[PDB]
Design a protein around this nucleic acid. Sequence first.
DNA 1: CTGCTTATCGGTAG
DNA 2: CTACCGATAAGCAGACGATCCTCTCGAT
RNA 3: AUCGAGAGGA
Lengths: 56, 134, 119, 101, 69, 56, 56, 56, 181, 30, 65, 183
Amino acid sequence: DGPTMREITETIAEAKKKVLDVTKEAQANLLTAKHGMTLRESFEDNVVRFLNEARD
Amino acid sequence: NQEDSMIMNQSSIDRGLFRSLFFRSYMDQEKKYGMSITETFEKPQRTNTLRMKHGTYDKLDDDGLIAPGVRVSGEDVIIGKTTPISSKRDASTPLRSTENGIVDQVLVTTNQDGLKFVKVRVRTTKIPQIGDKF
Amino acid sequence: TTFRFCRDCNNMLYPREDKENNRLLFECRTCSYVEEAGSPLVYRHELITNIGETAGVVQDIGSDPTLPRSDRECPKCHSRENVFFQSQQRRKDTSMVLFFVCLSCSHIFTSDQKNKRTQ
Amino acid sequence: LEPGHAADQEQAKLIRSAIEHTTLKSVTIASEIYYDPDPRSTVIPEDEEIIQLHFSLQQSPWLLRLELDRAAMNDKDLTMGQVGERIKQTFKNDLFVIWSE
Amino acid sequence: KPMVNESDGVTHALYPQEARLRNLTYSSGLFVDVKKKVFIGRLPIMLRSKNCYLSEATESDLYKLKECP
Amino acid sequence: LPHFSKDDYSPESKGFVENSYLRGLTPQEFFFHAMGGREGLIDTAVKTAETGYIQR
Amino acid sequence: NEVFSRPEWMILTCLPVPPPPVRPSISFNESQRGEDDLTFKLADILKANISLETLE
Amino acid sequence: SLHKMSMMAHRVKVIPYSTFRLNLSVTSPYNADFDGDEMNLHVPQSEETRAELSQL
Amino acid sequence: VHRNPARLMETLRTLRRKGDINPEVSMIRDIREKELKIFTDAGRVYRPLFIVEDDESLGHKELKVRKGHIAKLMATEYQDEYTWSSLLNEGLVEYIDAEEEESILIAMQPEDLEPAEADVDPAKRIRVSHHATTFTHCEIHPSMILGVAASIIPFPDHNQSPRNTYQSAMGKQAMGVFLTN
Amino acid sequence: DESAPITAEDSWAVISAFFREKGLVSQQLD
Amino acid sequence: MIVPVRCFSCGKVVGDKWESYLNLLQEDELDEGTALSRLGLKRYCCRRMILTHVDLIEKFLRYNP
Amino acid sequence: KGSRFISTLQVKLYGREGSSARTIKATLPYIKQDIPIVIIFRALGIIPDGEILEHICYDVNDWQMLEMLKPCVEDGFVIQDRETALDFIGKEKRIQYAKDILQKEFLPHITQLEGFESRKAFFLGYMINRLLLCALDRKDQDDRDHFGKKRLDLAGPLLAQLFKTLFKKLTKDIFRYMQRTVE
DNA sequence: CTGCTTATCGGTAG
DNA sequence: CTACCGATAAGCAGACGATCCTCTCGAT
RNA sequence: AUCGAGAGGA
Ligand SMILES: [Mg+2]
Ligand SMILES: [Mg+2]
Ligand SMILES: [Zn+2]
Ligand SMILES: [Zn+2]
């Protein structure tokens, strides 16, 4: 549907901003680690999660 | 046309789609370190030796080489040669067990050492049939 | 832990004890040269290190084009020119933090709001 | 979990941290060695308190000095003393031993 | 430029297309000028290299030597 | 790849295809998407043996 | 087992020889020759075995 | 041949053209598809054998 | 070792690109580990790749190449003396390998990659940005990352990745004319 | 107009150019 | 390797149209598209037939004997 | 330019995290075993504890590293000379032996000639310096799959490794109708 | 992404 | 006190791999 | 026909 490609799109688009943010959050020592994992593991894990959910 | 088969306009084959050629060649030389043991192209018969092939020879002229427009097929002898051990041991190449076509061209030459040499091609046209791939 | 070698043999010196007037006593098994203590410091460990964060920071830095560039200020020098990148230690357990190097005062500055730093 | 101890969202924690292996190292920032031969006082400003204070309810000149992170000390169900009495119990009497509170 | 010596004979000039037919080797001759003019082998030639006569060859020249262009 | 700045953990960069097999991928998408199953292709011809030994 | 197996047996005495069936011939051929690999090592062996009937 | 299934008696039907022909719905167990897969046949020789196949 | 290795590269680079040092040779200055590697070895792979230096008067960072050259090079299409190689030498184009790629920034299309920053037909795919101002050589054309066989596929971008790899083993099992003769 | 920059399209000429001068197997000859 | 006589899919002779078509292109300065339409080809099974036939024979006459 | 003689030098950091005192050794061609560096450094003339560390650590605020080498230094003020580093390696018959190996197969590119000893020290410093950058995690593992540190060997180079291999034969079958000529 | 063999160390007996 | 025996720990070495298939090149 | 190397189909 034309206006679905407009929803679809933006839809990825708010996950771009969550990744971003979390990235920014993270870069600021802020982002918190997940019992037993690298805080870097949790940034990865959040993002990958944010975008699978987007695809979805 | 399922589970990736497909269905083909047999009329259009007929008009030519997807057809091809198909040639193959076969080859031959004379003898090894004989001063007295030298294979010889010929068109055979028996001579005292008599293993000679189950198939037909009658398509080969003396030289021992079919001729061009001849149609061969089946187990036909394409190239007669014999190899004399003490005597006339057939040794001679027939057309593939399965294959049939036509002679296309035949060549005769030779090697570094003055050696006899021969290469026969056969040609066949193959048409889109049932089981073929695409 | 900054230590020190003999003058006289450029080797390595070591340590004993001012028993006697209680103090410290470094010293070569190269000559017999000797020294009074730098500092009592004598061995450092660190297991959690900040000594590799900045790393190769180098006038040339500013031209290397693989280096991305940000919009900040450096705080001494006022410009908008920098160039940043994550901490160079290549530990697994490390801060996803940034570091900038300004371009006109080769000033180095940080992305981080919690941790305090001098480098 | 134990049977009624089913959701002490808390009783899980203990267990955690009842189980969850855990070295000095994990918490230890940096480990150092000064010659501070002078028991009764330090060479280092930062230690001075820590000196009025060890006697309320021999020794060598060579001080081993571990620093601890603020962190692992929160992340872990964690205590100096704990550390300490750990350190002290390993060794009993063969090392002498103190901290900041 | 590649040649070839048929037994009982001259040295032929060698042509890719020819060797392909008679099982010969498009290879060329190996000469060293050894001190106190001399050959020691041949050396298979990379067709369309610096020796392969087809390296300088025109289109029309090819077909001529029967060689696909 | 080298069309990208360094120390970049953003999406694009990190193999996030965003378009569809329909509108289509871009260069990087393609190439990434190519590491895709090479991994795939690979283990496949690797499952395939681990497997048939089991089975024996 | 006393009758079927015995350490001395375990070491060699006298070595069977396998008849043709197990290892024949021919070739391109006829009048020239020839053979599998036991026939050839089945020499190496009756080989050095005559070098030693010729010292002794 | 991983299952019993990859084996199995049929019922013959001669026909023109040169491909073994089969029913789709006997596909899985063999796990064929038809962009190429090739397949073998065997033929029993004993009146039992035959039984063995048609029965079991 | 070398102090002022900057003033050196430059020089290096003008010299391979003038033609006085071979164009093979690779020429990598890591800034930040303070090595400078020069490699002439043989067997290394390498390529495209065209060039960018800011090398502009009337504004910003550009490609050196130009409708000028391109258009004389075409020149040489209908005359069927401007050859690729002369591009090489007049420095529009350089050869890169692997190692050296590490220290550049390549741009993709060069277009819509460096004309300044100023609607979207919704069916075009989605490109990212421009984010980068550094470029030093811009890709010749992306399609070449492909090789002889895929280069033949109608559209493989709209296309799942291993499939394309299968057609590429098949393409070589196609029938047709292998040679005029 | 000579100076002016390029566009996409235009790169195919440049490719063209390479290829005429090296062909498909350079690598082996070279 | 020569134009075909008759289009595969459909039926129609075409083979008699090859030279005519290189002639409208080459000479009355026309787009294949027109040409085509102008030689009568209207279905694209049939268009297809010509817009491709690719005349490799022109090159194998190039070899001699 | 000049053979295929293959010649693998390694610098292993014996010792795991914490495991006692992290000593460094290395390895060499026709050899018995390994060698603490310090020696070998002694052996190329480099002798003073520290006129070495320069060869390796390049700046002097890097205690960390320094220290990291502190226990190597120790494995040798069991050897405070040039001729007894040469030593360590099986007298006059076997010192030769080693002033060889450290020209003839200990880092051959560089050179095999006489005097080109510090040329290598230095390198072996290098090595070592990346060998510690990498164990102090300020730098990353070396990637084995960068196209960049691989080559292809095309036809050239290969025609080429036979050509030398047979040109080597005609070459010396001939050092033989020749031995048997006398005339 | 080990089962076997060898070497070293802590224990028991003379 | 010293010697011998037993147990434990560490280091070094060994054999397998999809099924079935067609074909091509070359050699004592 | 043995024997060894690569290529290809599922
Ligand atoms: Mg299938
Ligand atoms: Mg299929
Ligand atoms: Zn001294
Ligand atoms: Zn039609």
